[PDB]
Design a protein around this ligand. Sequence first.
Ligand SMILES: *[C@@H]1O[C@H](CO)[C@@H](O[C@@H]2O[C@H](CO)[C@@H](O[C@@H]3O[C@H](CO)[C@@H](O)[C@H](O)[C@@H]3O)[C@H](O)[C@H]2NC(C)=O)[C@H](O)[C@H]1NC(C)=O
Ligand SMILES: *[C@@H]1O[C@H](CO)[C@@H](O[C@@H]2O[C@H](CO)[C@@H](O)[C@H](O)[C@H]2NC(C)=O)[C@H](O)[C@H]1NC(C)=O
Ligand SMILES: *[C@@H]1O[C@H](CO)[C@@H](O)[C@H](O)[C@H]1NC(C)=O
Ligand SMILES: *[C@@H]1O[C@H](CO)[C@@H](O)[C@H](O)[C@H]1NC(C)=O
Ligand SMILES: *[C@@H]1O[C@H](CO)[C@@H](O)[C@H](O)[C@H]1NC(C)=O
Ligand SMILES: *[C@@H]1O[C@H](CO)[C@@H](O)[C@H](O)[C@H]1NC(C)=O
Ligand SMILES: *[C@@H]1O[C@H](CO)[C@@H](O)[C@H](O)[C@H]1NC(C)=O
Ligand SMILES: *[C@@H]1O[C@H](CO)[C@@H](O)[C@H](O)[C@H]1NC(C)=O
Ligand SMILES: *[C@@H]1O[C@H](CO)[C@@H](O)[C@H](O)[C@H]1NC(C)=O
Ligand SMILES: *[C@@H]1O[C@H](CO)[C@@H](O)[C@H](O)[C@H]1NC(C)=O
Ligand SMILES: *[C@@H]1O[C@H](CO)[C@@H](O)[C@H](O)[C@H]1NC(C)=O
Ligand SMILES: *[C@@H]1O[C@H](CO)[C@@H](O)[C@H](O)[C@H]1NC(C)=O
Ligand SMILES: *[C@@H]1O[C@H](CO)[C@@H](O)[C@H](O)[C@H]1NC(C)=O
Ligand SMILES: *[C@@H]1O[C@H](CO)[C@@H](O)[C@H](O)[C@H]1NC(C)=O
Ligand SMILES: *[C@@H]1O[C@H](CO)[C@@H](O)[C@H](O)[C@H]1NC(C)=O
Ligand SMILES: *[C@@H]1O[C@H](CO)[C@@H](O)[C@H](O)[C@H]1NC(C)=O
Ligand SMILES: *[C@@H]1O[C@H](CO)[C@@H](O)[C@H](O)[C@H]1NC(C)=O
Ligand SMILES: *[C@@H]1O[C@H](CO)[C@@H](O)[C@H](O)[C@H]1NC(C)=O
Ligand SMILES: *[C@@H]1O[C@H](CO)[C@@H](O)[C@H](O)[C@H]1NC(C)=O
Ligand SMILES: *[C@@H]1O[C@H](CO)[C@@H](O)[C@H](O)[C@H]1NC(C)=O
Ligand SMILES: *[C@@H]1O[C@H](CO)[C@@H](O)[C@H](O)[C@H]1NC(C)=O
Ligand SMILES: *[C@@H]1O[C@H](CO)[C@@H](O)[C@H](O)[C@H]1NC(C)=O
Ligand SMILES: *[C@@H]1O[C@H](CO)[C@@H](O)[C@H](O)[C@H]1NC(C)=O
Lengths: 434, 48, 48, 123, 119, 119, 119
Amino acid sequence: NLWVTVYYGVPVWKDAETTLFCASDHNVWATHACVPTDPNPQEIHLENVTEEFNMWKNNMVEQMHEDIISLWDQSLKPCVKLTPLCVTLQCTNYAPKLRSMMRGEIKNCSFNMTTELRDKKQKVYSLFYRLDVVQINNKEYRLINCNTSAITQACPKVSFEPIPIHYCAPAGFAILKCKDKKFNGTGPCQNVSTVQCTHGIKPVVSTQLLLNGSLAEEEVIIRSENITNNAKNILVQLNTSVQINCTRPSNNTVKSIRIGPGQAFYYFGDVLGHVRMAHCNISKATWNETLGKVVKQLRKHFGNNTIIRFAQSSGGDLEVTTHSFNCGGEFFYCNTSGLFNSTWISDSLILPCWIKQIINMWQRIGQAMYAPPIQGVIRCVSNITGLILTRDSTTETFRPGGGDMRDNWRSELYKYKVVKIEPLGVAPTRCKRR
Amino acid sequence: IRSENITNNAKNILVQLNTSVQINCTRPSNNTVKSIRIGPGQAFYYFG
Amino acid sequence: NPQEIHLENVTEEFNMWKNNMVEQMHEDIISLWDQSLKPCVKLTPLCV
Amino acid sequence: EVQLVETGGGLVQPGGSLKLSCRASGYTFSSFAMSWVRQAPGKGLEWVSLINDRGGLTFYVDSVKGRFTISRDNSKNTLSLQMHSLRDGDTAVYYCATGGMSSALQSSKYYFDFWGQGALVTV
Amino acid sequence: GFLGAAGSTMGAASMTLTVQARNLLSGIKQLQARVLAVEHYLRDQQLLGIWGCSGKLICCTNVPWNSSWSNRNLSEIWDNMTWLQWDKEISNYTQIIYGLLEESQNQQEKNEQDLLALD
Amino acid sequence: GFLGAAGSTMGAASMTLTVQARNLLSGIKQLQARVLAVEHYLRDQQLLGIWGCSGKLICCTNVPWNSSWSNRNLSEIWDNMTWLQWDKEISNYTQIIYGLLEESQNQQEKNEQDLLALD
Amino acid sequence: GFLGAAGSTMGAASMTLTVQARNLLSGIKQLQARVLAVEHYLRDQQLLGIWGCSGKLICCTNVPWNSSWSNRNLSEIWDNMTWLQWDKEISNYTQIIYGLLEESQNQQEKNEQDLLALD
Ligand SMILES: *[C@@H]1O[C@H](CO)[C@@H](O[C@@H]2O[C@H](CO)[C@@H](O[C@@H]3O[C@H](CO)[C@@H](O)[C@H](O)[C@@H]3O)[C@H](O)[C@H]2NC(C)=O)[C@H](O)[C@H]1NC(C)=O
Ligand SMILES: *[C@@H]1O[C@H](CO)[C@@H](O[C@@H]2O[C@H](CO)[C@@H](O)[C@H](O)[C@H]2NC(C)=O)[C@H](O)[C@H]1NC(C)=O
Ligand SMILES: *[C@@H]1O[C@H](CO)[C@@H](O)[C@H](O)[C@H]1NC(C)=O
Ligand SMILES: *[C@@H]1O[C@H](CO)[C@@H](O)[C@H](O)[C@H]1NC(C)=O
Ligand SMILES: *[C@@H]1O[C@H](CO)[C@@H](O)[C@H](O)[C@H]1NC(C)=O
Ligand SMILES: *[C@@H]1O[C@H](CO)[C@@H](O)[C@H](O)[C@H]1NC(C)=O
Ligand SMILES: *[C@@H]1O[C@H](CO)[C@@H](O)[C@H](O)[C@H]1NC(C)=O
Ligand SMILES: *[C@@H]1O[C@H](CO)[C@@H](O)[C@H](O)[C@H]1NC(C)=O
Ligand SMILES: *[C@@H]1O[C@H](CO)[C@@H](O)[C@H](O)[C@H]1NC(C)=O
Ligand SMILES: *[C@@H]1O[C@H](CO)[C@@H](O)[C@H](O)[C@H]1NC(C)=O
Ligand SMILES: *[C@@H]1O[C@H](CO)[C@@H](O)[C@H](O)[C@H]1NC(C)=O
Ligand SMILES: *[C@@H]1O[C@H](CO)[C@@H](O)[C@H](O)[C@H]1NC(C)=O
Ligand SMILES: *[C@@H]1O[C@H](CO)[C@@H](O)[C@H](O)[C@H]1NC(C)=O
Ligand SMILES: *[C@@H]1O[C@H](CO)[C@@H](O)[C@H](O)[C@H]1NC(C)=O
Ligand SMILES: *[C@@H]1O[C@H](CO)[C@@H](O)[C@H](O)[C@H]1NC(C)=O
Ligand SMILES: *[C@@H]1O[C@H](CO)[C@@H](O)[C@H](O)[C@H]1NC(C)=O
Ligand SMILES: *[C@@H]1O[C@H](CO)[C@@H](O)[C@H](O)[C@H]1NC(C)=O
Ligand SMILES: *[C@@H]1O[C@H](CO)[C@@H](O)[C@H](O)[C@H]1NC(C)=O
Ligand SMILES: *[C@@H]1O[C@H](CO)[C@@H](O)[C@H](O)[C@H]1NC(C)=O
Ligand SMILES: *[C@@H]1O[C@H](CO)[C@@H](O)[C@H](O)[C@H]1NC(C)=O
Ligand SMILES: *[C@@H]1O[C@H](CO)[C@@H](O)[C@H](O)[C@H]1NC(C)=O
Ligand SMILES: *[C@@H]1O[C@H](CO)[C@@H](O)[C@H](O)[C@H]1NC(C)=O
Ligand SMILES: *[C@@H]1O[C@H](CO)[C@@H](O)[C@H](O)[C@H]1NC(C)=O
């Protein structure tokens, strides 16, 4: 003899996909539309609540990807569009005074650029990296993108430095944070807590190696959608960071010319001192220990008596064959073949790096950006907090892979799930309406 | 036959048929289409 | 015929230099000006 | 086991006041409704008052609505009753009882599960 | 705290209804999210109003429990079960219950109108 | 008229509550303003609902006045004071009062549920 | 079904009020349409609240029928007339009725407050 009683405000929630708000504490990522963060955010532990998570079906990754691309494009829109730069270049090798086994990496290109008035042209001598030009057939060159896309110049006043971005639930929704140590990105999570916003996630854009991210609480964690499927990427989250010191040692001098009313073109003018190659320093012992830990964790899935071999990326665009990253305002492409070249059976390392000014990001074709050169010598120190690996028999072979930015977000968003609150419910009580 | 004002010559008359009339329309010439690049990322398609 | 209601015995402290209606009017006037100019001839060829 | 132990007064002149205090153990006090049931020395028993598990609701027999107040302190595991204007017809043994009501989300009671030993109130 | 009772029993969680009720309401994509959140909130409030529960968080009704929906004891539901488990167990019966609640309130409104019509 | 009672006493102004209640509700920037105005309105209606005042403009409650919040006489508040002055005097106590009102209604809802459970 | 009673008598149509009530709520141009639809819904709910009808679909009041608004018999209105015809016949009197309903509820709220003030 029980009756239906209606309850509103019950702690019941169903998985849902919604739009999250942006919050943050010139900069390409800083946005005036992001709400100031909570000076002391509340986190509520949900005792005795088990929630099934799946980081590869987490729609927060797709929103972050869309928001990062949208902010990038909005930043580039109010900037100089270098349409006049797709001209025939007449290039010679930079040829510095001293011999340096890097001849031809920097070219001294002469071209006729536009100016403030449409009846005059200005002869310009600019330095370009070898990777930014192709030969037409002094030799004639064109920019790599004049065949595919127009150049939008990034504004020199807007920094590319990643800043933390917090994603906050809209009212009616909640974000569940896993907090289950050694959680592998899928399955039941027993330490679930409710948060108003995510932690601060830096929009670090890199391939192969994950920089300035979160670290594992106790052990290296290997996460994959399907560990046996060779077409899926493996995200390795480290418990200890590996410090990487990357520099652009050449003292590049930046020059600027006016190309139209209100428009100026910034270009690599000269090199002071000697030409020196960009490079990254990784401690050899630390990396060797890091790989030993990764191999142990991989053996847990692939077999205690198998052989794990690391090798360089087999091919594709430089974006995916090298470790792409941006620090100091410059875009670096580091080989990494010295880090993944070993077979694991039952003082410092230096990585050569190339720098590019014409960057095609977010694997898009048709929208190229020109990164202005940064005056002086630049150096950055960052933490390697995770790896991206792919897999190709007793011996298994792993390669850096990478290139899909969604996986970089996944390495931070794997702990969060968005749920819709369903405040209505009914239950039988001994309670009859009058 | 539908019109806003049937007696007003300035208004159109819309005639809705109860049976359709089949119309077979063609461009019988075997036109060959060519394409040239006119700028970075831009191509012009023309009747070749 | 807009309504105006006198508030008898109400004293309110005003400050015209902290009045956010000025900033909105400034933004709206600039926005309308720019919207009006957008669909108009851009005289790029005149810088000769 | 479950035990209810009454503490209270003795002989009080007609028209005065007396308060009983009943301690309980062996069960969660806050999970059960409590009642007081009265038995005159030569009669059977009658219900006098009922209090909910939380203490918010109290019910009384019409003849005692203006004289008796029932209250409960769930932190002290104590059920007390206070009576004023003690009439000659109110002399009796007053028993604590556990049961008699439940708060909608529990199975029905409408009976008394546990009894104390009884305080004797005389006039 | 908000949803802190999610792992608690239905009885214990029924005492925190105002925490979630308060937290439910608390460019184009964000406006769509806010308008949709408001529409959802209003749909739930309208649905409570249709049932005669417009001002209550705990609203008792005149619809009996069929026992086919769930044949569990009150102690099994209120003391040994959470709201997430309960919601999962009867997720296939909420439209039947909602329909019965709407019909029952419509009958109640007609009965109240007729009782008020007695001079 | 709208806000015409703002300079009047609290008693006199309490008789015009429907004028302001009606007037409260009556591209991107304007949509944000309208959505926010709706969210504010709904927050106030939800808050009244939490207190059991969902359908009333003048709603009496079971929360006693502490006298620490204000030790003024009823004539001082209702005959010799305006709502703006009153709001200023207790602006530091409205969260305490709101919390007490929410707790009191939660207790009332549980008591009503238990009273309805008596066969 | 939604509006299926539109051609039915007022009596028959009064039994389907929840169908339309549920259906009423169910880039820039669409957001404006949705925000306006919400504002209209809330204006109607606020207006019912002002009259003391916040939780009812059929709400009886204390305002007498003047007979100048319509001198028809109850059978003529409820059995021989539809809601569209009725709405047309009194379209010139709805503001008078709404004003009287608001005044009557304001008087009722003051009377309830004074009755609750009797110790
Ligand atoms: C990972 O995080 C570290 C630390 O936040 C990043 O290194 C930092 O990068 C910024 C921007 O390049 C440096 O600021 C610069 O400092 C020089 C100092 O002379 C100044 O001239 C510049 O104008 C600018 O202020 C900052 O010092 C540097 N910190 C350290 C410790 O090196 C790193 O870049 C991040 N990794 C990635 C991939 O973004
Ligand atoms: C790019 O090449 C031009 C031409 O070879 C360089 O300009 C010459 O610089 C030398 C420096 O000793 C002068 O003697 C010549 O008279 C210059 N000729 C012209 C036409 O300018 C220019 O310096 C080179 N750019 C860089 C950065 O090395
Ligand atoms: C620039 O234009 C002149 C003609 O005015 C031409 O002779 C010269 O070769 C051009 N320079 C380059 C680098 O194409
Ligand atoms: C030019 O673009 C085509 C596709 O449009 C591409 O296949 C080709 O490789 C590009 N040229 C160079 C030198 O990369
Ligand atoms: C859940 O959190 C508690 C906190 O003390 C911890 O002891 C427990 O190990 C956590 N669960 C898992 C699976 O780690
Ligand atoms: C790198 O890790 C160390 C570990 O203590 C931390 O102190 C440092 O701030 C980290 N740096 C970055 C850029 O995350
Ligand atoms: C990191 O993880 C390895 C296992 O992969 C473990 O042996 C090591 O102690 C851990 N170190 C820290 C600092 O957590
Ligand atoms: C992650 O853990 C779950 C635990 O149920 C397991 O089923 C799944 O296969 C694991 N995946 C990987 C890549 O280790
Ligand atoms: C995972 O990959 C294996 C092949 O290695 C395939 O047979 C299996 O169906 C895949 N499972 C999923 C869930 O993708
Ligand atoms: C780079 O060259 C500039 C030239 O003015 C000089 O001031 C600066 O100190 C140099 N920096 C380094 C690191 O050589
Ligand atoms: C990076 O630079 C700092 C500067 O003090 C140095 O202490 C650290 O050892 C360097 N790391 C590597 C891997 O070279
Ligand atoms: C370190 O390098 C040596 C090189 O011989 C290798 O044998 C060893 O497995 C590596 N890892 C550790 C943890 O020593
Ligand atoms: C691999 O070694 C670990 C060491 O603890 C052991 O627990 C695990 O069962 C071993 N697996 C196999 C397949 O031998
Ligand atoms: C990295 O260095 C090795 C050295 O043999 C070379 O074969 C490889 O092509 C280099 N990687 C890239 C991307 O150039
Ligand atoms: C359409 O029908 C109506 C019927 O009232 C008639 O008044 C009107 O003139 C007609 N129009 C045409 C164009 O036939
Ligand atoms: C229709 O047209 C006639 C002229 O043919 C004109 O006299 C009449 O007023 C028009 N009526 C309307 C409604 O336009
Ligand atoms: C049109 O010409 C093309 C030329 O390759 C031929 O393949 C095609 O069949 C021709 N179609 C007709 C309808 O003549
Ligand atoms: C979780 O379960 C334990 C079981 O001992 C219980 O004591 C605790 O109250 C539960 N937590 C909540 C929030 O109900
Ligand atoms: C209970 O549900 C079953 C299945 O829908 C139905 O056949 C039965 O008539 C229902 N009983 C009551 C009393 O509603
Ligand atoms: C304003 O104050 C005067 C004082 O004489 C009073 O008569 C009048 O009613 C007040 N106005 C209002 C709107 O209450
Ligand atoms: C009145 O307020 C004071 C200060 O907050 C507090 O100490 C006191 O207990 C309150 N009294 C009541 C009856 O709420
Ligand atoms: C329409 O009118 C007919 C008249 O015979 C009546 O029988 C029927 O019920 C009416 N329809 C509705 C929906 O009321
Ligand atoms: C009825 O309406 C008329 C016209 O507005 C008005 O003069 C009359 O006083 C009204 N009677 C009542 C009782 O409201």
